[PDB]
């Protein structure tokens, strides 16, 4: 370390960053962009709620139906093995030695099946309404992506200036009207 001499000290470099620092602090502070970059930085604390909202609705309307599909399968199952159970019983009565007794018991047991179908068939058809209805989350979860994309657009030009229930709704309309 012999050549040269009059060389910037560690302080002189830091000394300089400080000047550029204050200079910055103040161009923004005077041109009023100290403002701008502060409206965009405080938007982030919000959009994190909207993106954590879309994941709420998602983990819901996705476990909701998944729960119907969960409870509708048992009935499609039961109702199907019984029809298959009886289709067998009958094929046999009709192939085996006539047995009037079994002929009665077979009619009794299928008239029973005929009676239970509705219970299963209905329920399963009521879960399909769960699955449907419950999906509404798109429209909702969708309008929040509608807005949250408009916000990400401002936060964009702000760095462009600087760089270029249903029960309450009735209590209302009915209490004031």
């Amino acid at each position: 370390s012999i050549k040269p001499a009059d060389e910037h000290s560690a302080g002189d470099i830091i000394a300089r960053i400080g000047s550029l620092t204050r200079m910055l602090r103040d161009s923004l502070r005077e041109l009023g962009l100290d403002q701008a970059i502060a409206e965009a930085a405080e938007a982030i604390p919000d959009a994190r709620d909207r993106l954590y909202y879309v994941v709420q609705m998602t983990a819901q309307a996705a476990e909701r139906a998944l729960n119907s599909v969960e409870a509708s399968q048992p009935h499609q199952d039961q109702m199907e093995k019984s029809a298959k159970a009886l289709t067998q019983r009958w094929d046999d009565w009709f192939a085996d030695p006539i047995d009037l007794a079994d002929a009665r018991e077979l009619v009794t047991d299928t008239r029973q099946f005929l009676a239970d179908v509705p219970a299963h068939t209905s329920f399963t058809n009521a879960q399909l309404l769960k699955i449907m209805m419950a999906q509404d989350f798109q429209d909702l979860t969708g309008q929040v992506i509608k807005r949250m994309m408009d916000v990400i657009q401002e936060i964009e030009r702000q760095l462009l200036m600087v760089l270029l229930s249903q029960d309450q709704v009735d209590d209302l309309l009915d209490s004031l009207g």
Binding site: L129, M132, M133, Q135, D136, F137, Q138, D139, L140, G142, Q143, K146, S165, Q166, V169, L172, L173, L176, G177
Partner: protein, 128 residues
């Protein structure tokens, strides 16, 4: 109400128009048509036949409140029933649409029970 009653379901989201179509199918109304915004809605109301309208609020080209006042101000559709089905919940907007001449108001997410409940409350006061 007469089961042939012609409905006009207006909303910018497919998901949500189809969910209301079905809900109406369960209620027996199979003469239903869709619209994606205020303008397209008025375009079909121009064709004629409609006797009942269910609309959303937030939509491009012409929002719901603009479509509501447009129908209430047109001499040939002024009394056309209009049930609101939207996500807006600020007492200020409920009032706003209320004073604009809204037949009814339903907030999303809504139950199938709630839709029928307000569809009948509308057929009741209009003797439909």
């Amino acid at each position: 109400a007469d089961k042939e009653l012609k409905f006009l379901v207006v909303d910018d989201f497919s998901t949500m128009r189809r969910i209301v179509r079905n809900l109406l199918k369960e209620l027996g109304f199979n003469n239903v048509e869709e619209a994606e915004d205020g303008v397209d809605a008025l375009n079909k109301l121009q064709a004629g036949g409609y006797g009942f309208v269910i609309s959303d609020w937030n939509m491009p080209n012409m929002d719901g409140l603009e479509l509501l006042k447009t129908i209430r101000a047109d001499g040939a559709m002024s009394a056309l029933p209009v049930l609101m089905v939207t996500a807006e919940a600020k007492k200020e907007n409920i009032i706003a649409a209320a004073q604009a001449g809204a037949s009814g108001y339903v907030v999303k997410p809504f139950t199938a029970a709630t839709l029928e409940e307000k569809l009948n409350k509308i057929f009741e006061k209009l003797g439909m």
